[PDB]
Amino acid sequence: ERGWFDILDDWLKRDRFVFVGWSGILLFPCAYLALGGWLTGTTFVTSWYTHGLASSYLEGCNFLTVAVSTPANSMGHSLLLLWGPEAQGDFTRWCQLGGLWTFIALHGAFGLIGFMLRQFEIARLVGVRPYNAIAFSAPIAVFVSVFLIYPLGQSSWFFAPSFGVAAIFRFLLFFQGFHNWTLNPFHMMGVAGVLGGALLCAIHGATVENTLFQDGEGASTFRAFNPTQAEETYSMVTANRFWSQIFGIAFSNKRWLHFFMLFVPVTGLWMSAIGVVGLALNLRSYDFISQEIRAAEDPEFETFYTKNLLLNEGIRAWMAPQDQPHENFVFPEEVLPRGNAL
Amino acid sequence: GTFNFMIVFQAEHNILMHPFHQLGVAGVFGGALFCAMHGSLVTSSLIRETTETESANYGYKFGQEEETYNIVAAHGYFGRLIFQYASFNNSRSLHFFLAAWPVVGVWFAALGISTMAFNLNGFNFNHSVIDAKGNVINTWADIINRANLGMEVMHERNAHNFPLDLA
Amino acid sequence: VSGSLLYGNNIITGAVVPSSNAIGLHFYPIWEAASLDEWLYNGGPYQLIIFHFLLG
Amino acid sequence: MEPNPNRQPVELNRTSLYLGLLLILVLALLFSSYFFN
């Protein structure tokens, strides 16, 4: 066997500055276009016709406020292909209709597939276990649930997140006011995995750096390590005693420690994704029914739970007319929910 | 009550638009990313010491002198994933980065709250973009503003007697 | 505002509620109240807890 | 009957017991409010 396939395989897998691989054929164009599309849109492209917003440096936005915004609600879940029945091959009209949104989301999705394939491909060539690729399933579950499944359960791509700093912040506040997403135990598990992961990152980094063996004469201790050295660079035994005495428990097994560091943030992200799949259908943890029954009958009963719903009702009434322009909402001053004075 | 604090904080300080909270988010998202990354890379390069009918965790014994994974293989992997010089070959440097990234970000998060405590608030681009006539052209900042207004007008609905919420 | 389990809260809605705006930044230890009933009405537990916690 | 050679003993160490009970109890503490609604 020495055909063109194997010759191509040879070239693809050459040890170069930027590894390519078979996965590179999917990854590099899709990632490049996703990123290029974002930079192109945020630099030059409006959201006037889809959202009634300026969204580019060209129009006067800054890095925080630029976005590539979702298509108009009237587009539904149109693939919005350049050559599709909406844009009909017109690049300018395609930009004005939000074609760059599906462009970025879809090349982004195929690019993420390419990146994970790259993780598998390289692991296989180098001869390591593919836990990095496995861990990357969490970013993929988040991207897919939030940017694809969520809008697919809603009326249109309009309600997906727009690709932008301020736009994403709007997406957070929308989820609070409309979905009460903070109340959702799947989001809560996500939070614990993210914050728990950040905790593990900090505490493990600090513990290693503070249980180092003296392996050099330097007061700056980084040079006193050699990649090829056989020995542990820090004392697991001393680390274990420290935490056992400070916190009550401590790791004693390095393999477990490092697996747990994979498990925690990965599991968190996967949990948050499940909650978002529910939100695609408005299947929220919005309310506690027992709370509502009590509060309806008893005007003196108040909790932080009832207080947050009042905030949500304000968010919805105050943001909906500008945030959902296709609804043509007109809410007279007199109907707007407000407390005293404000 | 925590969520209540967060929502009211957003109304009154536009924390999301504050760079110290943004550094905080980079700190915790990044902390989680690097946690998963480090976990996965060390786990990926564990030296075979066990059979398939047992946990690989038994391949490490508490207090052993020899490292339990191959950092050269780990770096060999990650350096090819991105490119050679974006990967750490020094465990001390790597672990310092793991400590520093989340800690510094969270210091900025803390300082965000501690400085918005004195009402130096998030970026305010409300009506920043204006057309040739003077019409306001909304940006996503203005949509944020509408959400914030909802929070503001509704919070502590019986507590304010005067038009401005000054503390 | 009800924060406790026995007064109609679950784990998610429940809290120890911050001390009264009437108190402000005034130090409100148990002995500054005329009774435990007053102390509780005004959110004395919050101050006791957060001050001991922050020190600890 | 002639014994099955594919049989393997199963293990759960104490730490795993503790970790597992913590997971379960904390999940229960989290989800219980929603089950009661």
């Binding site: 009550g248 428990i249 | 508490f62 | - | 229960a28």
Partner: peptide, 30 residues
């Protein structure tokens, strides 16, 4: 009954902390 349930789970977790600390399998250098 709900309150009992919440407090019961919490109390089990606290007991678990006690056993996990004072009755852990001791770490041993081999």
């Amino acid at each position: 009954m709900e309150t009992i349930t919440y407090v019961f789970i919490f109390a089990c977790i606290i007991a678990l902390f006690f056993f996990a600390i004072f009755f852990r399998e001791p770490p041993r250098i081999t």
